[PDB]
Design a protein around this ligand. Structure first.
Ligand SMILES: NC(=O)c1ccc[n+]([C@@H]2O[C@H](COP(=O)([O-])OP(=O)(O)OC[C@H]3O[C@@H](n4cnc5c(N)ncnc54)[C@H](O)[C@@H]3O)[C@@H](O)[C@H]2O)c1
Ligand SMILES: NC(=O)c1ccc[n+]([C@@H]2O[C@H](COP(=O)([O-])OP(=O)(O)OC[C@H]3O[C@@H](n4cnc5c(N)ncnc54)[C@H](O)[C@@H]3O)[C@@H](O)[C@H]2O)c1
Ligand SMILES: NC(=O)c1ccc[n+]([C@@H]2O[C@H](COP(=O)([O-])OP(=O)(O)OC[C@H]3O[C@@H](n4cnc5c(N)ncnc54)[C@H](O)[C@@H]3O)[C@@H](O)[C@H]2O)c1
Ligand SMILES: NC(=O)c1ccc[n+]([C@@H]2O[C@H](COP(=O)([O-])OP(=O)(O)OC[C@H]3O[C@@H](n4cnc5c(N)ncnc54)[C@H](O)[C@@H]3O)[C@@H](O)[C@H]2O)c1
Ligand SMILES: [Zn+2]
Ligand SMILES: [Zn+2]
Ligand SMILES: [Zn+2]
Ligand SMILES: [Zn+2]
Ligand SMILES: [Zn+2]
Ligand SMILES: [Zn+2]
Ligand SMILES: [Zn+2]
Ligand SMILES: [Zn+2]
Lengths: 347, 347, 347, 347
């Protein structure tokens, strides 16, 4: 069954050369399932890990990818509630200690001892990958793993973000970057949660996707000179909560100025060396909160996958081969990425 | 009874010359009480209004002061629940429309039609001042107005701040600037609310005051080279919620780095041209919220004055004459202001 | 313009004889608008006030009706933000003191000095009725007052209820009584807010209405022997939050047993002499909250009318004449009332 | 080291004869620590389990006790973050699946697969007891296990209760039963959390203990004919949140009538066959919530033990021998139990 080797996209140096090579099969640990990753979404976090954009250092050599979805071909001796052949998902947060004050409060992502799939752990860009059994996702039997894969890191993330904005049904939510991997899922989640979804994006075929997936008001950031004025006029005073899934520091800076008094500006995107320089006078006078949202926890994964299972969200995926993966980064560095890309580990 | 003129500190131009002059008695409007301001605290907001540090423009000529406490010598024809001779307080937020979506949610301070005592309305640096009857403070009979006056804008403010940090009893709260007008009241409120109060301040006689009023750990910002390291070591991982009552943009910038994961950094101080340039990567990874807190609303005023009436808080006040007021600004611009100053309108 | 008399349904004794008689025009007070009530919904609260089912005593003689919707033909001298000819709504809570600790926290309905339209104040079953100007509803210009009228007391009520259940999008909400005046609006609001709406009702043509307005799972209380088992099987463990808009004490009693652990059982209906006898062991073991929800406040009115203005909710109204009103009570006492009834004051 | 047998209080039938007998040493499972229980508090839950007062059936034969505190003399092969000789605590909730939707949200106590120490698992009334390694309490090194033991089930319980009442600092909290095992710890926690603690209890030496531990207003339930009137007069309108740690159904019934509008009535005590028959009219009109609170979770255990470690709480313990345990039940059935009793496993 479980082979001796496999294929995988591995790079031995930051910003180096991606190698679609042959790598050994990862033996599962005492509590880590061995999942035959069928499909795996490509997240911009993988591009950041390749470029080395973040202060934390990656593990080298690295096989990226933190949105794996596959079958449990193997399991460690100590795993509790899993069966071989079941569907499971390798999220960004591979595992935690489950014993510090962060994992006790449900904030498992903010843990000092967190294994990050594809950053400090062999990710999901490989045929077989290992992932903890208490943190992996309980993908229901019968789903289409290709469609599920983008939900595992871009779905739970924007779900947790919109839950962190402290919005109510009917409150304007302005997805800043609402045509990308997270922007489109953010729009679908915010539409399913009852909010009124404004969107801010630009490029070729961004407005078409945004309108199709169920947005309300789209504001082109490459054709509107004053974005703040446009959002203040469209939302009648500002968005009640902004989600910054963009990769532009200027977008984040302009995001704290079109949110209402008593609003909330969730920071989800983490561009390279970006600082949210919000004016203190305007932030205090308007009581604007600027929350930061990291990947969702286990309850958030359950609720996001439950939104998916109901058919409310559907990430627009381009399924390609694994070998094409380097070009995707180029297509993602230029910004020409619409929706999400998923890689099939088979090819 | 109500005279024809009075004395007041009035300035006709931003950063101009403060004039302890004779000014007419303000006739109350249809719903505004006429309060004989007995004492009035001096808030740093008055210094900012004098310097013109804020983008919004003041009304000129202006008599500053938004912490007035006095007796209701007169009342408009339409006031509902007030009696002549009762004790009342002129807060910063003079009045609101009580009809927009901000006043309906209790966020009366964030209202487009808000009268700001001492900024867009003749403040409390005068013998008799007028203030709305639904927004003024219900100062209980028997209190000492001299001690109450600093509670009216510096007490409700830090009470609302600590309530905005979403702290629990036992959670470390790091008052950044915990020896000034708001810092000392913030320390007393955070101590009465159950939090463990760390303090960050420096100068002559700041640590003595901080220890006396009930602080736990004091970190001298003029003798600790690495404040972030000191707070991370003292709080064991960071403060669970920071209150930025300081007037240093550098303090605000360093305040987003010693707050725990899932923390909260309430911005209360509004220095001149200050920007909270928090790192986006470190904010998103740690889920750090950066809330801004403006003056408290009517419920917050009630609860802050109720903390005062129990004797839990006591602002260290230096009661001086009104004529001394200009020098106070100097003593406040240099930073040598410890605790709070209150002016007696009589002299 | 404003006439000398008018027609109105007035009863001089509890459970007495309803008299469609001629009554004088109510002169507006200093702050109370005089609204020419065009249409007025008939709420079961009016039936309870007629029967005397509640411990509090009504004012006699009384013209009931607390869901009035009309034009502002007159206004008191002290009203602030109203224009003659504008659309306004007489809600259940006519007015408050706006000065106690309940009105300061936004809980204006829980006020010791609350005027209740149609209970302690001449209600909206009359051509012209008076209602406070800070508490009345800001009905947008262009709406259809006939359709708006049921939203004014049955819409804001169930909106506040579903907001009190502390639900999340995707959480099962079980409207117990989901075909009546409040049940149908509760179903539409819970569907617009993202929840998954289960419904419990029975009779002739209740399931048809429930399916039409957008319910998910309907459980017939006159054809299911074990309602608790049915809800536990349909919701997979119980409803995440129940709304008790029914008028059966048995329904309320059975409502605390099919709500999940960590659930919430909002009590909205107030039957005559009803007691929610929930088992203490089962409530403590499952951490079940039993919240009670009274009419919504001004923010809740704004958000409920904003849900209506978007076209998300639509109360199924039977518009009849005012003279028919007594028979409605019969049609409401027998339980044959489907949706809502509205009376046109003209006829 | 670990012996072959031990002594323990074991009963083979509900309400039968307690046998201080010799029982074998429990071998730890794969993930369960073996704790040499030094001391163990006696909770009224143990009396209920002996009497069979609850619908759920106990495991027979049973050694009760769910407040064990001891040293980790042994550990299973799969335990993660424990060392032999460390201090640990056997709480009521022995362990959970950590995989259902309740354990994911932190509500581990509400789990269908929950091991209850001393109810479905050999409790802490024995020299050596086994308890899961992810759920046991991290008792800091240096504490006095005798004093800690009552915190493990009566401390975390009332801490979670007072956190469930949604109180603010300064809000009156009325501990109903504020001289018993939970009442005294509830008073100390509510005093440390900032609330104003009213107390309701009666008997010999209850008021003395309540005054000593830091209560504010004591209301004798055996000398006040009208408890509701007394609490409404003392709290000025009612308690802002009630904690029902009593064992009287009448106390629970009267507890929903002296809580303010928008209050909260946490149900902590679970008397035999008790029903909280709260009036629906009075509950809906006043928006009174009736929350039920079960044992606290891991975060709640951490925060309660952290309140203890600061020296803020101190359960008044009578340390006795294990053999005396049956008489304690008598002393607890008659109601003559003041504070808490702890048993030393050595004797
Ligand atoms: N916080 C988390 O838990 C988490 C998880 C995964 C990814 N991320 C981060 O999210 C970011 C975005 O990921 P993605 O998959 O959406 O990337 P993407 O490149 O697929 O999409 C980025 C989007 O931003 C839009 N955009 C670019 N400039 C803009 C501007 N000035 N204003 C508005 N929109 C603008 C683009 O048009 C595109 O729609 C990355 O930094 C990624 O690492 C966060
Ligand atoms: N947000 C509101 O509702 C509200 C209301 C009133 C005032 N304010 C603002 O609060 C600010 C402070 O007011 P105040 O009365 O406390 O002023 P103050 O001058 O009396 O006290 C300022 C304090 O900051 C300390 N400080 C200075 N530099 C510091 C640094 N680098 N790090 C830490 N602490 C430092 C000083 O030593 C002093 O203790 C002003 O900008 C004022 O306008 C806010
Ligand atoms: N709390 C508030 O703010 C507020 C405001 C207005 C009205 N109310 C109260 O709401 C209650 C209901 O009002 P309404 O207009 O919906 O009344 P209604 O008579 O129009 O509708 C009652 C509904 O209850 C259903 N029902 C009857 N027995 C049932 C049972 N055993 N199980 C489930 N459903 C059952 C009926 O079939 C019907 O669908 C009244 O007591 C009213 O006074 C509350
Ligand atoms: N919910 C939970 O997580 C949890 C955990 C442990 C125990 N409990 C339950 O808590 C209850 C109480 O436990 P305990 O250790 O405090 O019991 P206890 O017998 O030690 O103390 C009971 C207290 O109730 C007081 N009391 C009696 N009648 C009263 C009345 N009419 N009004 C007010 N006070 C009255 C007594 O005087 C005494 O102070 C038990 O039912 C127990 O099983 C709950
Ligand atoms: Zn990602
Ligand atoms: Zn951890
Ligand atoms: Zn101020
Ligand atoms: Zn306003
Ligand atoms: Zn009604
Ligand atoms: Zn009131
Ligand atoms: Zn117990
Ligand atoms: Zn579980």
């Amino acid at each position: 069954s479980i082979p001796e080797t496999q294929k995988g996209v591995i790079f031995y140096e930051s910003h180096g050369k991606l190698e679609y090579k042959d790598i050994p099969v990862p033996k599962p640990k005492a509590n880590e399932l061995l999942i035959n990753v069928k499909y795996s979404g490509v997240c911009h976090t993988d591009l950041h890990a390749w470029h080395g954009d973040w202060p934390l250092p990656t593990k080298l050599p690295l096989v990226g990818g933190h949105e794996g979805a596959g079958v449990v071909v193997g399991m460690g001796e100590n795993v509790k509630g899993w069966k071989i052949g079941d569907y499971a998902g390798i999220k960004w947060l591979n595992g935690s200690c489950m014993a510090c004050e962060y994992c006790e409060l449900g904030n498992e992502s903010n843990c000092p001892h967190a294994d990050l799939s594809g950053y400090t752990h062999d990710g999901s860009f490989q045929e077989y990958a290992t992932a903890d059994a208490v943190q992996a996702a309980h993908i229901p039997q019968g789903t289409d793993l290709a469609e599920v894969a983008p939900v595992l890191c871009a779905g739970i993330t924007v779900y947790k973000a919109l839950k962190s904005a402290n919005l109510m049904a009917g409150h304007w939510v302005a997805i800043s970057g609402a045509a990308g991997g997270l922007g489109s899922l953010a729009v679908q989640y915010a539409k399913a949660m009852g909010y009124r979804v404004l969107g801010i994006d630009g490029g070729e075929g961004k407005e078409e996707l945004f309108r199709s997936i169920g947005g309300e008001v789209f504001i082109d950031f490459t054709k509107e000179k004053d974005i703040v004025g446009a959002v203040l006029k469209a939302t009648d005073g500002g968005a009640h909560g902004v989600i910054n899934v963009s990769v532009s520091e200027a977008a984040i800076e302009a995001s704290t100025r079109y949110v209402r008094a008593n609003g909330t500006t969730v920071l989800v995107g983490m561009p390279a060396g970006a600082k949210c320089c919000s004016d203190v006078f305007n932030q205090v006078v308007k009581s604007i909160s600027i929350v930061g949202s990291y990947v969702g926890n286990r309850a958030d994964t359950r609720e996001a996958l439950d939104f998916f299972a109901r058919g409310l969200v559907k990430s627009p995926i381009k399924v390609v081969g694994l070998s094409t993966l380097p070009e995707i980064y180029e297509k993602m560095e230029k910004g020409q990425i619409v929706g999400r890309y998923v890689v099939d580990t088979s090819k």
